[PDB]
Amino acid sequence: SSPGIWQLDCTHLEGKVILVAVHVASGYIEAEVIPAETGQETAYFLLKLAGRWPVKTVHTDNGSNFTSTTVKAACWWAGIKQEDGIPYNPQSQGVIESMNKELKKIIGQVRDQAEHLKTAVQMAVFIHNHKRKGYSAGERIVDIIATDIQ
Amino acid sequence: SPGIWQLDCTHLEGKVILVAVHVASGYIEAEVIPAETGQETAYFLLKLAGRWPVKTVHTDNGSNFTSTTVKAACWWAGIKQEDGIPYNPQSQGVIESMNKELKKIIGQVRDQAEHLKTAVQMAVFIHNHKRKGYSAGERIVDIIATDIQ
């Protein structure tokens, strides 16, 4: 049930890991920088996400986060259906890859306004979510969920 | 009023919990930091503003209002930085009752979590999903969508 579906995505820059959750129907994202991608870091990220938006299903980014009993524990706690991220629609690989390339492009455009990577990544989240492609992803996600609530 | 948020800083376990409240819905975001600094408050506002359409923030005290780092983030993210004077004295009470509720919830989960930051995020989840009716998470999406339309 597609207002509530999100996809995890993990990409790397500067020897660090940027973990992203994408709301599939709108392309809105949340992201954070962590030193490496562990079940504990992924579980905490998902607890954060589910306290902020009505997360029904998460498609995990890889088999290690799908297997992780810590990740399964957070998804139980927060009431999320934990699913695999197999691109049964091959259009998903491309969408995620193009998203990672866009975010890295934005990060480079700001990277020198920020001493730390985490600031640049949050600046890139802001720019991505506010960009009008015309509605922005931040407007699409609120419209979609409000439509569902009503 | 869809874009109005209030900062609030409360303390537990020798640590600081920074909260932003969306005033019209009561929805909240929060984090644990070792102490309140302008840099920490500035980063939290940058995070908030990338996730919701933050027009105005009422700062939680005069040090965050003065901090040029906080002003720099509010410039970056397009937020009007305002004071947090409770011209409506009901604001004082609402924030204090909120902090007491969050600490209650934190105590109710605290033993499912090794670290305070997990407990605080469990409490954010319970607060935003609580039906008071509609929940604060429903109210904030309702209000912003209504404004967009």
Partner: peptide, 8 residues
């Protein structure tokens, strides 16, 4: 440092 996150 002339950075948004480190104005020094």
């Amino acid at each position: 440092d002339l950075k948004i996150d480190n104005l020094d």
